[PDB]
Amino acid sequence: RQEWEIQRDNADGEVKQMDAQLESLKIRREAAQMQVEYQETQQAHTQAQ
Amino acid sequence: SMAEHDDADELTTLLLQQGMELATQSIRIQQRTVDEVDADIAVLAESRR
């Protein structure tokens, strides 16, 4: 039973770590979207030139 | 000759303004990158726990 308890703690820690990685990933996605907007702005600037 | 010089100056000014706007967007992108690094630090803290 003690061994089972240790395994349960390990699984819980894994779930929490993955939950935090989700936040990291969505921040990266937001950065990529802003990069796309930056590229579109560059194209508009060339058109204006 | 004067018309030619004036047109060149106007083009240079337009280039400078567009560069300024792009610089602002780059500022925002870099701030987002820093936030991502902070999220990675949080993930590491959970793993250490």
A interface toward B at CB cutoff 8 Å? 13, 16-17, 20-21, 23-24, 27-28, 30-31, 34-35, 37-38, 41-42, 45, 48-49
* B42-46, Cβ contacts within 8 angstroms, sequence gap of 24 or more: B42/A20, B42/A23, B42/A24, B43/A17, B43/A20, B43/A21, B43/A24, B46/A13, B46/A16, B46/A17, B46/A20
For B22, residues 6+ apart whose C-beta sits below 8 A from its C-beta are A38, A41, A42, A45
Elucidation method: cryo-EM
DSSP A1: -
What are the backbone angles phi and psi of residue A44, rounded to the nearest 5°? -60, -40
Measured distance CA(A46)–CA(B22) in Å, rounded: 12
Question: Looking at the complex, does the CB of residue B48 fall below 8 Å from at least one CB of chain A?
Answer: no
CB pairs under 8 A between A and B: 52
DSSP string, A3-48: HHHHHHHHHHHHHHHHHHHHHHHHHHHHHHHHHHHHHHHHHHHHHH
Declared resolution, Å: 3.4
How many angstroms separate the Cα of A47 from the Cα of each of A40, B1, B18?
11, 27, 12
Answer whether A31 sits within 8 Å of B39, measured CB to CB: no
